Amino acid sequence: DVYAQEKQDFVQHFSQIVRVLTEDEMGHPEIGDAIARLKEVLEYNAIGGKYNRGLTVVVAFRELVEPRKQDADSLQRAWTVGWCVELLQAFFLVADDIMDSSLTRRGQICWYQKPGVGLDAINDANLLEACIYRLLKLYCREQPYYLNLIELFLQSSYQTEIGQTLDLLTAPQGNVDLVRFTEKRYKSIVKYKTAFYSFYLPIAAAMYMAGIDGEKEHANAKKILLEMGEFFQIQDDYLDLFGDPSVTGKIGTDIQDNKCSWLVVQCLQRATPEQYQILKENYGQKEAEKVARVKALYEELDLPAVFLQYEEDSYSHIMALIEQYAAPLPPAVFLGLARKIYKRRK
Amino acid sequence: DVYAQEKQDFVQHFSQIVRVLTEDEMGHPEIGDAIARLKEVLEYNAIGGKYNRGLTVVVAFRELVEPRKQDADSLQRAWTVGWCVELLQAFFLVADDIMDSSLTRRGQICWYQKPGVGLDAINDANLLEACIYRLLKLYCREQPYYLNLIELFLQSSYQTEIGQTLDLLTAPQGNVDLVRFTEKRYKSIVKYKTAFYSFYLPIAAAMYMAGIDGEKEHANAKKILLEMGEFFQIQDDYLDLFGDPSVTGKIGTDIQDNKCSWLVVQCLQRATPEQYQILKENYGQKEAEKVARVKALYEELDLPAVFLQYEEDSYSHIMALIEQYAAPLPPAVFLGLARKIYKRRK
Ligand SMILES: O=P(O)(O)C(O)(Cn1ccnc1)P(=O)(O)O
Ligand SMILES: O=P(O)(O)C(O)(Cn1ccnc1)P(=O)(O)O
Ligand SMILES: C=C(C)CCOP(=O)(O)OP(=O)(O)O
Ligand SMILES: C=C(C)CCOP(=O)(O)OP(=O)(O)O
Ligand SMILES: [Mg+2]
Ligand SMILES: [Mg+2]
Ligand SMILES: [Mg+2]
Ligand SMILES: [Mg+2]
Ligand SMILES: [Mg+2]
Ligand SMILES: [Mg+2]
């Protein structure tokens, strides 16, 4: 509901984000064509998702700053930073689609597959990351939280980068190993590859902008938000295989890529010895025939129910933690976000 | 000579760079395997070049700080930052080899071609970039130039990123257009893709660490160093086609990739109408037969002499600029670097 009413404001402010990025260097008409492609890149990769992260920065701001201080300028910084988290999303997604050999994202062909693009997407992605800090300097160079934000973004990027590495080491194409698809490994992977950038980044950005920079308060908000991250990745691993691609906006690839997905981990735990061998014979291959064999053993082990039960048990634990750790922050902050991902299908 | 005596110190300090990066997160043994691959990545991509940029940071430091202040700690920051510019080099090169479809770098198979690696190099490269700011915080979090350095690196990355985009837009594989291979375009491309990160970054880092942060002094050092950048790229475009790959450490690819190389631009200027058509028919194709046809028309137009004459005329203009703009800095600073790239073959 709150993301709903703020969504439109958020998106309309994207025109300006683009204006500022594609003009601040246009007094150098030499790099104009380059700046032109940047507009194009942003428009294609920054737009089309749910904006949960960017909205979260904005929503969390309004709930942590006394309305006497939510002035005109200060409010603008909120959605610029919200759009900065949105650009981090774009950076990492463009890269990840290349690396996961994905076909669609946000219900279009992935950037790297847009004809004319391909592996130039690599440079396009770095550019997206570069813009984060262009905006940060443009709109906050003078706030006292300016250095806190630069470091929170850098730090978060590094973290998810470690995550991605963890992700990729565990899923060697051609090296089907199920032994490594454990639980400690999964929790570690999703923590670094999703949790920090998708939940602690937005809320922490809003805290630092609202003066809330105590170490314990971030430590506590993080304790909640990292647990929401893992929930959120597990939802995503599920939808990879069990969701409608016309609705997720992306065609799933986890089983083919030999990914340490939640399912394959929960599948190993319930694996009768015969089934294990079936999993060992079909996982991590591009053959449709073999992939469906996998889906089948998932459905034979009623995992699609285990996921629904985890979802409940998990959602209540998050709740418990919001009840344990939220204060002095408004529980609205964490409830609002958590309510926006419960049962989701995209 | 000065890079010579400082080289070894510089390289030996790499053991510690690696120690600090692969231990500061090892109190989290979960991401240990990831941290393991980071060691591996660094060792493969940070090591093996000439270290001109990193040495430059170090050499330029010793020449701008009164020896009374070149203490133990302060000196360590110098080569850490020198190694940070070295990591930026690695970041961009790993990416560029993928995008240029290169085969070797620094006399080994490119990272992305190391079997087991491929497009995961994309994430490995981002990690390299991430380490820059890990070190920056580890060793300078408390210097007064701390924010100046973070912004100089970010800014320089963005700049070379615009450059790379400029580079790639101009060289569409399959779209052989010679009309775009002009001079204004070339100067613009090399300025952003090489000049800022390879010459202004190192020297400016050393200036900021030595307190020299006046706007005019950086503006003047930049005026010299941007002109050295263009010289240096033109040398590189030449060696691409006319240098021994066993000595450059890399197999050239400019003609195949349809690159706006210096040669092809100087070739268009001297193109009799018949030759132009020959260029139009062979440029930007992978066929060895057609590539050599190109090399031939270059040698028919004695470009390998035009490059030697540019080299002289250019080197003297740099000299003039060191004589015009160096002060209050020691001309040694700019002479030292410029003397380390004159006539180079690798
Ligand atoms: O499942 P992935 O981790 O590859 C993914 O969730 C992206 N991602 C990457 C890090 N965190 C999330 P996507 O399904 O959107 O391709
Ligand atoms: O010639 P490129 O610009 O591709 C190169 O010089 C790398 N580079 C990229 C930007 N600046 C330099 P390399 O020959 O080393 O592949
Ligand atoms: C960590 C994950 C699952 C990456 C995609 O997340 P979202 O589905 O929330 O990304 P948007 O397309 O809405 O940006
Ligand atoms: C801009 C260019 C030419 C990239 C390679 O430069 P260097 O040849 O100086 O890189 P190193 O391998 O010595 O790092
Ligand atoms: Mg992925
Ligand atoms: Mg993916
Ligand atoms: Mg997924
Ligand atoms: Mg290149
Ligand atoms: Mg190259
Ligand atoms: Mg080159």
Select from A35, A131, A168 the Cβ nearest to the Cβ of B123: A168
What is the rounded distance in angstroms from the CA atom of residue B68 to the CA atom of residue B75? 12
What is the rounded distance in angstroms from the CA atom of residue B39 to the CA atom of residue B293? 44
Q: Which positions 165-194 of A are in contact with B (Cβ < 8 Å)?
A: 165-166, 168-169, 172, 184, 188, 191-192
HSE-up (13 A, CA, CB side) for residue A179: 2
Give per-residue burial for B194-222: e unless 16+ CB within 10 Å, then b. bbbbbbbbbbbbbbbbbebeeeebbebbb
Q: Can you list the alpha helix ranges (DSSP code H) found in B175-253?
A: 183-190, 201-209, 215-242, 245-248
What is the rounded distance in angstroms from the CA atom of residue B114 to the CA atom of residue B103? 10
State how far residue A147 is from chain B, nearest Cα, in angstroms. Answer: 8
Is A222 marked within a binding site?
Answer: no
Q: Count of domains in chain A?
A: 1
Return the C-alpha torsion angle A265, A267, A271, A276, nearest 10: -80
Q: CB B34 to CB A123 under 8 A? A: no
Q: How far is the CA of B255 from the centre of ligand 2 (A)?
A: 13
DSSP per position, B285-332: ---HHHHHHHHHHHHHTTHHHHHHHHHHHHHHHHHHHHHHH-TTS-HH
Q: What is the bridge-based pairing of β-strands A104-105 and B108-109?
A: unpaired
Total Cβ atoms within 10 A of residue A113: 17
- Residue B195 DSSP label: I
Q: How far, rounded to the nearest angstrom, does the alpha carbon of residue B35 sit from its chain's CA centroid? A: 26
The resolution, in Å, is 2.6
Q: Can you list the alpha helix ranges (DSSP code H) found in A141-255?
A: 146-169, 183-190, 201-209, 215-242, 245-248
Query: Which tokens in the block code for residue B114?
Result: 């190391």
What is the rounded distance in angstroms from the CA atom of residue B9 to the CA atom of residue B136? 20
Method used to obtain the model: X-ray
Contacts of B167 by beta carbon, 8 Å cutoff, 6+ apart: B189, B193, B259, B260
Residue B252 belongs to what domain range?
A: 1-346
State how far residue B336 is from chain A, nearest Cα, in angstroms. Answer: 31
**Contact between residue B284 and residue B173 where contact means Cβ atoms under 8 Å apart:** yes
> Where do we find the tokens 């910084």?
A77
Is B259 marked within a binding site?
Answer: yes
- What is the count of residue pairs from A and B with beta carbons less than 8 Å apart? 116
What is the rounded distance in angstroms from the CA atom of residue A229 to the CA atom of residue A233? 6
What is the rounded distance in angstroms from the CA atom of residue A70 to the CA atom of residue A61? 9
Q: CB A123 to CB B165 under 8 A? A: yes
Total Cβ atoms within 10 A of residue A115: 6
> Where do we find the tokens 């360590």?
B76
* DSSP H or E stretch at residue B105: strand B104-105
Residue type, B195: A
**Contact between residue B145 and residue B209 where contact means Cβ atoms under 8 Å apart:** yes
**Residue B212 is part of a domain; what is its CATH number?**
1.10.600.10
What is the rounded distance in angstroms from the CA atom of residue A76 to the CA atom of residue A74? 5
Residue type, B335: L
**Which residue pairs from A311-320 have beta carbons closer than 8 angstroms and sit at least 24 positions apart in sequence?**
A311/A231, A311/A235, A311/A342, A311/A343, A314/A231, A314/A234, A315/A231, A315/A342, A317/A227, A318/A224, A318/A227, A318/A228, A318/A231
Total Cβ atoms within 10 A of residue A13: 18
**Residue B106, ligand 4, Cβ within 6 A:** yes
Per CB-CB distance under 8 Å, the chain A contacts of B98 are: 119, 122
Ligand 3 atom nearest A193 alpha carbon: 1
Is B97 marked within a binding site?
Answer: no
What is the rounded distance in angstroms from the CA atom of residue B192 to the CA atom of residue B201? 12
How open is the CA angle B14-A149-A218, to the nearest 5 degrees?
Answer: 100
**Contact between residue A207 and residue A225 where contact means Cβ atoms under 8 Å apart:** no
**Which residue pairs from A135-143 have beta carbons closer than 8 angstroms and sit at least 24 positions apart in sequence?**
A135/A17, A135/A20, A135/A21, A135/A80, A135/A81, A135/A83, A135/A84, A135/A87, A136/A81, A136/A84, A137/B151, A138/A20, A138/A24, A138/A80, A139/A76, A139/A77, A139/A80, A139/A81, A140/A77, A140/A80, A140/A81, A143/A77, A143/A209
Q: Which positions 257-276 of A are in contact with B (Cβ < 8 Å)?
A: none
**What is the set of active-site residues of A?**
50, 91, 96, 100, 105, 167, 193, 232, 236-237
**φ, ψ dihedrals at B108, nearest 5°:** -145, 175
**Residue B89, ligand 4, Cβ within 6 A:** yes
Q: How far from B42 is each of A319, B111, B175, B205, CA to CA, in Å? A: 42, 11, 36, 22
Query: Which tokens in the block code for residue B294?
Result: 């190109």
Q: How far is the CA of B14 from the centre of ligand 3 (A)?
A: 38
Is residue B104 classed as helix, strand or coil in its secondary structure? strand
Judged by a CB distance cut-off of 8 A, whether residue B38 touches chain A is yes
> Where do we find the tokens 């050999």?
A101
Give per-residue burial for B308-326: e unless 16+ CB within 10 Å, then b. eebbeebbeebeebbeebb
Q: How far from A130 is each of A123, A134, B98, B269, CA to CA, in Å? A: 10, 7, 20, 36
DSSP per position, A268-317: HHT--HHHHHHHHHHTT---HHHHHHHHHHHHHTTHHHHHHHHHHHHHHH
Ligand 4 atom nearest B194 alpha carbon: 1
